[PDB]
Amino acid sequence: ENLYFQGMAYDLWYWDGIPGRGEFVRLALEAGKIPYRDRAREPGEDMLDDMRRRRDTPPFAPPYLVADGMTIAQTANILLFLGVEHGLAPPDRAGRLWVNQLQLTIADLTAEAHDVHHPVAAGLYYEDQQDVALRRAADFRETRMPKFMQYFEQALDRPGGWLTDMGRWSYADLSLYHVVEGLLHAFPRRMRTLVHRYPRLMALHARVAELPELRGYLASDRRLPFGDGIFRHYPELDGA
């Protein structure tokens, strides 16, 4: 590597090994063609030591992005920055606030997808909370997934095939693609039932998958598969 334009590179800090929350940021950086370093994936990485450093603006948890001497944490907050700085969101306030709330709603769904298998405690193993997971999964499948998906289906009721009227994808379109990917992995049977209800959502999902901007990244070693992150396939939690 070591080519000139990488002097502008942002530092992204998020766990190696799973897509996780970091994936929402990474999708925007890749599609936006914004130079960055995936610091925790580098051989001599020390995210432990980096995150405990004295900062004026300390991250509570990953992901965080270091840009212009700023340390920016919270997935939606990092993307808000990229939206304004790199044009991944509308130019006007109304548009940016719309994209921000969409991203926050996507983050809500994403958290629910994690909490389905960790309903008692993020810090306890799934195995010790499986009985609770079975109960929470029934609600998540029966009420939560349709509610969120109907909402995004209605958000997409506009000319041009994106979440906004900006005439191109926003970072929220990328994030919506990703949460659908996550749900397809974690709940394949339930999605099989539900996808027919949401043709605009599934057209959006398909359209992002085929973006020229993302072709390279999605086929690359930088795109990690799902596993034991947010979106986990436990067949006992799935259902028609």
Binding site for its own copies (CB under 8 A): 56-60, 68-70, 72-74, 76-77, 80-81, 84, 93-94, 97-98, 100-101, 104-105, 108, 111, 115, 119-121, 123-124, 129, 132, 135-136, 139, 143, 148, 151, 154-155, 158, 165
Q: What is the CA radius of gyration of the chain?
A: 18
Q: Choose among Cl ion, its own copies, none what residue 8 binds, the Cβ cut-off being 5 to 8 Å by kind.
A: none
Residue of 1, 49, 127, 131 that binds Cl ion (CB under 5 A): 131
Interface with Cl ion: number of residues (CB under 5 A): 13
Is residue 19 a contact residue for Cl ion (CB under 5 A)?
yes
181-220: which residues touch Cl ion (CB under 5 A)?
none
Beta strands at 36-38 and 10-13: parallel, antiparallel or unpaired: parallel
**Taking a C-beta distance cutoff of 8 angstroms, is the pair 133, 116 a contact?**
yes
Q: How many residues does the chain have?
A: 240
Closer of 56 and 127 to its own copies (Cβ): 56
**Minimal distance in Å, beta carbon 55 to Cl ion?**
5
Minimum CB distance to Cl ion, residue 206 (Å) = 20
Q: Of the listed pieces 1-9, 199-207, 211-219, 224-232, which binds Cl ion according to CB under 5 A?
A: 224-232
Task: Please choose, out of 4-12, 92-100, 102-110, 230-238, the segment that lies near Cl ion by the rule CB under 5 A.
Answer: 230-238
Provide, rounded to whole angstroms, the least separation between the CB of residue 171 and Cl ion. 18
Smaller CB separation from its own copies, 105 or 175:
105
User: Per CB under 5 A, does 71 bind Cl ion?
Assistant: yes
Q: Is 149 in the site for Cl ion (CB under 5 A)?
A: no
Cis peptide upstream of residue 63 (ω within 30 degrees of 0)? yes
Which of 2, 220 has the CB closer to Cl ion? 220
Binding partner of residue 110 among Cl ion, its own copies, none, CB cut-off 5 to 8 Å per kind? none
